[PDB]
Amino acid sequence: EIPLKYGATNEGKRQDPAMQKFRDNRLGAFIHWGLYAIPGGEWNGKVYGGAAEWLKSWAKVPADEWLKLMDQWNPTKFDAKKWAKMAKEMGTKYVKITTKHHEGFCLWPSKYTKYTVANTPYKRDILGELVKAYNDEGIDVHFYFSVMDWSNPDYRYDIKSKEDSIAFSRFLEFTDNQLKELATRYPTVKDFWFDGTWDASVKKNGWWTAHAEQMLKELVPGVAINSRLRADDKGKRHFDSNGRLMGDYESGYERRLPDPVKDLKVTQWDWEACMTIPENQWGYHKDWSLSYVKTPIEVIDRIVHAVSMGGNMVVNFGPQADGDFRPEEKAMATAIGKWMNRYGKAVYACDYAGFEKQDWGYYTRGKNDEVYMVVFNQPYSERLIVKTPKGITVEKATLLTTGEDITVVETTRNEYNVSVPKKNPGEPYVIQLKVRAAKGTKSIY
Ligand SMILES: C[C@@H]1N[C@@H](c2cn(-c3ccccc3)nn2)[C@H](O)[C@@H]1O
Prior knowledge:
Blueprint: H1 17-25, E1 27-31, E2 42-43, E3 46-47, H2 55-58, H3 63-67, H4 80-90, E4 94-100, H5 126-136, E5 140-146, H6 162-185, E6 191-195, H7 200-203, H8 206-219, E7 224-225, E8 272-275, H9 296-308, E9 312-317, H10 327-343, E10 361-365, E11 371-375, E12 383-387, E13 392-399, E14 408-412, E15 415-419, E16 429-437
Parallel strand pairs: 1-4, 1-9, 4-5, 5-6, 6-7, 8-9
Antiparallel strand pairs: 2-3, 10-11, 11-16, 12-15, 13-16, 14-15
Helix pairs in contact: 4-5, 4-10, 6-8, 9-10
The structure holds the ligand C[C@@H]1N[C@@H](c2cn(-c3ccccc3)nn2)[C@H](O)[C@@H]1O.
The ligand C[C@@H]1N[C@@H](c2cn(-c3ccccc3)nn2)[C@H](O)[C@@H]1O is lined by residues 51, 53-54, 195, 198, 254, 274, 282.
């Protein structure tokens, strides 16, 4: 055991109501919106294949010239109520918004820098508008915040001199100032999701990460803080030198997911995954023909996969420079929403079920020990294998949409064939199970 002043604080999962809400929400949307939406992956006639929100980096653009894009920031089709409606319709319970990305342009009128929405033709506090509009729809709002800031010359990638250290110390104060500002300007915020924290400068300043966490928790009761923020005394990130999770939830599954057989450890803590629709574009990119674009079922698969393992999933959108969403994104949100409106009882407020993974799809567990079978791969055998943990029996199966009864046949001790429905639902579908735990078993149930 190593002693630490800046390692983990939470013993296991938080169980206060605010965390239970963060968790029960399950499905979120991510919004990456910034100056990068203007060029949309293209600089001086060259279309770059890299992530559009990193175009400043791919095209080697200097800060002064990149930030002049502010002069073209005028999203005339922006309407926060419309965005909130789109999210509501998709079935998202929360939205995570880029308050400031690496480029350092702020979507709120920060008093600590000139690189904000206030100094654009549009002028308006976009972030405040969104907060209000989402909240009015009953949607929680989470703030993405990039510590790394390409707009501020006090930023350092590493601390290699006393000068570096003096500059970076000012930078951290500047950062603290922006964070306090967001927390006090927008007190309905439920979560801060830190990015751009991997540089050696931040690793060397573990103490600050812990302080940022504590500071925000004092300012916003019940607020959640992601693991990606945190470095310990030794510079170890996410999990401290004693293997303990820092922050309130684990936030490293980005465009990938834990293996449903080999990575069951994740069920021990809260966590959130995020994903993109194309392969690797977060900000708006004008040409989606350059990589694989996920279909709605492929996205729904990932959402359910996450919930089946006790995690959240956040699906990313990269709005156009005009403040509308491209057609592929409107289609996606609508398709997701349609499915969730039908089958969302197996997603919202659900969790890991403790059953062995089977090939047909995923289990999720409801608040009242409902066990949902979410079927993505339909067996030609017409039988869905269900192997129960020790002491658990299956008493009934019911097709969720119709209430029709589904035959359950015992094949061995602890295993059943659950029949597929008589009519093929023709889309991923849910069978709700009623299970019973014997007197004197172990496990939840
Ligand atoms: C949530 C996603 N995180 C950002 C990211 C992080 N990185 C990155 C780049 C180099 C090293 C480590 C991480 N690249 N892009 C993406 O631009 C987006 O905000």
